[PDB]
Amino acid sequence: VNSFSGYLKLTDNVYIKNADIVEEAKKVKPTVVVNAANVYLKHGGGVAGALNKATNNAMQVESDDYIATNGPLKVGGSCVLSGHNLAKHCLHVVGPNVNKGEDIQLLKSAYENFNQHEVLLAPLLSAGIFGADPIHSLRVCVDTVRTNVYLAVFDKNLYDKLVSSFL
Ligand SMILES: Nc1ncnc(N2CC[C@@H](Oc3ccncc3)C2)c1Cl
8 A cells, every 4th residue: 555646547557647746746755756857857847847846956956966977868768866855766767859859669768767666656758848649658658667657647638538548
């Protein structure tokens, strides 16, 4: 038993809710919240901009030190940093950005990072401003992640389409 509430169960291990991941994170304090990161950990907009704003820019400060030491992430890669006031840890995961021309096949590699964590609160990777189809992202999630994932979908209209079209 865990503290996630109001989720619809899609599979043995994937759950989905119409929720703001920031508000969801502040209430649940999950062990891991996933950020929709880019390789530079520049948290300017979308999920990343929202999560970072909720940390009063502490996520960005930590991220800039990470990049100065380690260099950029790979598309499809991840790093574990602090969850600040939102979670114990933040798993920064880089899905391919279609608006930058990145290969969509890298979406599966991106979701594989979730398997290193038993339970996660996450957005749909490569959705929103990353330009991929969220229905495809949900399919890849279900077919790749084996650990327990709680997906927060900000847009109610999108949440209803994802559920109604789920196979
Ligand atoms: N998945 C998302 N994609 C893009 N923007 C989002 N947010 C939530 C509200 C606002 O973010 C904050 C964050 C901290 N204080 C007030 C508002 C935009 C989200 Cl939740």
